[PDB]
Design a protein around this ligand. Structure first.
Ligand SMILES: [Zn+2]
Ligand SMILES: [Zn+2]
Ligand SMILES: [Zn+2]
Lengths: 258, 258
């Protein structure tokens, strides 16, 4: 049986090729996770089909219905066999799906226009002239919602009631908001994404300060999957071969335009 | 029953308290992993006994005899129920024991005596005046032995044939060798340890260059263990609550001497 892989359009992980109109199947896409999926499929020896998650979300459980959405939802309800994307390994998700060891280590970071007078999370929490937010339905937002750290809790109290909303639907919208806000909007996002964008023209953004936390992305499978064990060993094998480091260079700096 | 925890005397992870002769049981030790063990036990709800691995090794399989030694061996043969130490998550180990998601991210790094004209692995590979080696019997040595990357394979070719041996029995031995080498010996070791030593008197060593690779330490249990699931969730919960970050600051920088 062909393995149904659920993923999400997020540069440089999964993107449609410039000439995708004349292409079909998995060939329509390119990126870090597209290469990784190919690598995994080869070592575990299976055929697969890349599918973009219907609702474009990573995965969160509805507090009222208790229903999981996003890529996590597709695994939980059996719509997909494996998720290969920048999906954060978290406690709540670990309880409903399985994750391989991390294929990438990262942390929450700050993105500023450039020239913006901000160097740390503390700086953001001390003023109100510069607004800041995060993505929606993701591990980053949940981080600030649960944090007990003075600075982070103070930041959340602001973002929670901020008017208008400082939360964005996609990373692309976040970066776009930073760029057109005259340095009046800062964006909190995963370090890996921050670094990628900083190397993209108009080269007008920059990551500042150290990461606020440490986490990792993992390949996810439903609980009780015959692929979980194998995929986990594949990820470790790949990291040890240097393939994962080979791939990050290829999509982050080899294609850098700054 | 009381959970038997295997660990290793590696500062600042596990160390004998100054007046350990005056104490009993778990109270004899202190350190990052001693603190982590207490927390994992509380959150999983089990009583435990800390024991230092008999042979002072991390874990490797002897080709020919096929016997596992070190902490891995204690888990494989049933001498310990869990290992809480700076134990690297690797494919070969993952094949015989279970690892929780990582509680710490790190990579192989270069330690030099201050003033040594070395800034990268490439620098070490292109010269011969300065000798270099690694801990013997661990994942660092294995990294170089198994590497297919030009620079690292070149480094391994030298190290494996160097005489006298450039390998060391313990980290303390490696650090002492760097300090008394007058800059003629560089040491390859895990970043976390390098960072620790750089903050210790006499403050004469320093970490140079970026990490050679990326990986992590995980809590290990025997395959099929009843503790596996719970311990893994505990690690994720503890990371999301900031404890892991608190602990590293406590043992690395809060007690810095430089
Ligand atoms: Zn391969
Ligand atoms: Zn609802
Ligand atoms: Zn606790």
């Amino acid at each position: 049986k062909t393995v149904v892989v659920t993923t999400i359009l997020e540069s440089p992980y999964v993107m449609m090729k410039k000439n995708h109109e004349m292409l079909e199947g998995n060939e329509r896409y390119e990126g870090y996770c597209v290469d990784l999926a190919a690598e995994i499929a080869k070592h575990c020896g299976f055929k697969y089909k890349l599918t973009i998650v219907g609702d474009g979300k990573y995965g969160a459980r509805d507090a009222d219905t208790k229903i999981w959405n996003g890529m996590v939802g597709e695994l939980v309800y059996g719509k997909a066999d494996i998720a290969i994307a920048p999906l954060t390994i978290t406690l709540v998700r670990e309880e409903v799906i399985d994750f391989s060891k991390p294929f990438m280590s990262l942390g929450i970071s700050i993105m500023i226009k450039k020239g913006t007078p901000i160097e740390s999370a503390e700086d953001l929490s001390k003023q109100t002239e510069i607004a800041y937010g995060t993505l929606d339905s993701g591990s980053t937002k949940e981080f600030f919602r649960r944090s007990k750290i003075a600075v982070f809790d103070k930041m959340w109290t602001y973002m929670r009631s901020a008017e208008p909303s400082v939360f964005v639907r996609t990373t692309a919208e976040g970066v776009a908001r930073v760029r057109k806000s005259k340095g009046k909007y800062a964006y909190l996002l995963e370090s890996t994404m921050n670094e990628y964008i900083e190397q993209r023209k108009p080269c007008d953004t920059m990551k500042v300060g150290g990461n606020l936390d440490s986490k990792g992305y993992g390949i996810a499978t439903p609980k009780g999957s015959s692929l979980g064990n194998a995929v986990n060993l594949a990820v470790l094998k790949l990291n040890e071969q240097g393939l994962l480091d080979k791939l990050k260079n290829k999509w982050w700096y080899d294609k850098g335009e700054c």
